[PDB]
Design an enzyme around this catalytic site. Structure first.
Site: not given
Ligand code: 37I
Length: 489
Positions: A389, A423, A427-429, A470
């Site tokens: 998380d 996700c 943009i992150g994972r 990110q």
């Protein structure tokens, strides 16, 4: 641009800067070192300074009291145009207080001697390649090294730079307040020698391109106690060059189709639906395989999600989030349960077989269009769920095997369009997974002994969707995943 981010100042230096050299409306941004992915936006109001927390756990930049943004540059840009949304009321961002630190610059190599600099400019350099280093002879001065040419047709010219009373100069003319002010000046009007040659400053000398074979040694370089922090923060400095337009997502007709109203696709690479509404929060990502980076499905965009998958002829979906994480929905369940069949508008999906595994759950889905019936093609949905998380996994093995399985399923279908990766914000994972897959495919085809440039690849992907990769933790992970992948050969 980007000069307002101070990477090496404390909370005490921040308030002292804004009160001695700032006025009502001045601001800066600094990395909060209490939490590993938190930043602080310090603004001057009514003679005092306020501090707004910006937290990034890997999904987005969460401005407390504000909205969520893809980058810090897009956050500041939003509030310098929309005075009346950052409230305690009303926090105006008027004047960026520029930083003089040259650490996050691509051309600055602090502890670097003169003989190493020439060997780098001659081996890896070309015409217009330059760097700036700290002087060995005169402590406090600097040296500008340029390469000009096309055997003798090339040379390397040195230019001394001395620092006198917090100002820099090349021995004549104007005295600049910072190294970057000096470099940006002679990048605009370059120096001319006595007999003709002009010291053109084109590109900084490449430091980050490495041979994939000797990647374990380069990680030893960036990790000793930082190099990893330098390389990543320098990459973050270049995000201001990527403020491409995002008007189509800002239109009134499309406000509710975004999970986060300020995380929007670039207009020039957005996925356009042409069959009717054309908007979906998705971008096509190009590195002979392409990807689609998109947000988690909204309950009101599920029909549009399957319109995209059918249009782009995608046969593989990569989901790297749960439907709900912590407390809020990161994604809506857009697939029917095992052995069931659902209709999503004009599209029809059947869940044929769920194949659970160690790190993920594979779902074989039959996508088709209502009416003719023979539009049925198999869409393999890979659902990763061994992802924390907060932060990144400790071991890249689960992600690496997950990608190897996705890659073969894509390669076995010689008709497939882009690989859909999503996700929550996309943009992150989604950025970390796509970048690792791009870098592995280079090692896969060209074998080892090939060239790999991680920050160059991230910056290319970031030119196609705002804020791919990110956090520095994800940046650490990409290096660790490629290192682990080359040692398993
Ligand atoms: C189009 N963008 C783009 N293309 C290629 C590479 C990079 C880059 N990212 N990070 C980088 N760090 C570098 N070095 C380490 C930190 C330092 C000592 N301060 C300077 C030298 C050098 N290059 C980069 C970027 Cl941005």
């Amino acid at each position: 641009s980007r000069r307002w981010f101070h990477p090496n100042i404390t909370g005490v230096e921040a308030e002292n800067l804004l009160l001695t050299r700032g006025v009502d409306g001045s601001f800066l941004a600094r990395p909060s070192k209490s939490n590993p992915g938190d930043f602080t936006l310090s603004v001057r109001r009514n003679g005092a300074v306020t501090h707004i927390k910006i937290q990034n756990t890997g999904d987005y930049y969460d401005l407390y009291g504000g909205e969520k943004f893809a980058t810090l540059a897009e956050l500041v840009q939003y509030y310098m145009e929309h005075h009346g949304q950052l409230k305690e009321d009303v926090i105006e961002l008027k004047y960026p207080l520029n930083c003089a630190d040259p650490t996050s610059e691509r051309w600055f190599h602090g502890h670097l001697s003169g003989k190493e600099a020439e060997k780098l400019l001659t081996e890896k350099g070309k015409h217009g390649s330059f760097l700036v280093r700290e002087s060995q002879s005169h402590p406090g001065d600097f040296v500008l090294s340029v390469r000009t040419g096309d055997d003798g047709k090339s040379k390397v010219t040195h230019v001394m730079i001395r620092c006198q009373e917090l100002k820099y100069d090349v021995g004549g003319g104007e005295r600049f307040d910072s190294l970057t002010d000096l470099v940006e000046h002679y990048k605009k009007n370059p120096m001319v020698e006595t007999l003709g040659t002009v010291l053109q400053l084109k590109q900084p000398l490449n430091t980050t391109r490495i041979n994939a074979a000797e990647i374990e040694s380069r990680v030893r370089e960036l990790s000793k106690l930082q190099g990893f922090w330098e390389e990543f923060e320098t990459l973050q400095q270049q995000e201001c060059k990527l403020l491409y337009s995002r008007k189509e997502g800002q239109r009134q007709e499309n406000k509710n189709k975004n999970r986060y109203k300020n995380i929007l696709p670039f207009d020039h690479t957005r996925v356009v639906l042409h069959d009717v509404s054309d908007y979906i929060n998705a971008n096509i990502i190009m590195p002979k395989k392409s990807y689609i980076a998109t947000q988690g499905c909204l309950q009101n965009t599920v029909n549009d999600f399957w319109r995209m998958v059918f249009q782009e002829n995608s046969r593989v979906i990569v989901m790297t989030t749960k439907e709900v994480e912590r407390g809020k929905s990161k994604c809506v369940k857009y697939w029917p349960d095992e052995y069931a069949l659902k209709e999503y508008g004009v599209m029809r999906v059947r869940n044929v077989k769920e194949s659970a595994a160690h790190d993920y759950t594979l779902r074989e889905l039959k996508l088709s269009k209502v009416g003719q019936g023979n539009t049925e093609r198999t869409v393999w949905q890979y659902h990763f769920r061994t992802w924390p998380d907060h932060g990144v996994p400790s071991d890249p093995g689960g992600v690496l095997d997950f990608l190897e399985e996705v890659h073969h399923k894509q390669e076995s279908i010689m008709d497939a369009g882009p690989v859909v990766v999503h996700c929550s914000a996309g943009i992150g994972r989604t950025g970390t997974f796509i970048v690792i897959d791009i870098l592995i495919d280079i090692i896969r085809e060209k074998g080892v002994d090939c060239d790999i440039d991680v920050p160059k690849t991230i910056q290319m992907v970031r030119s196609q969707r705002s804020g791919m990769v990110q956090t520095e933790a994800q940046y650490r992970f990409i290096y660790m995943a490629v290192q682990h992948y080359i040692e398993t050969l």
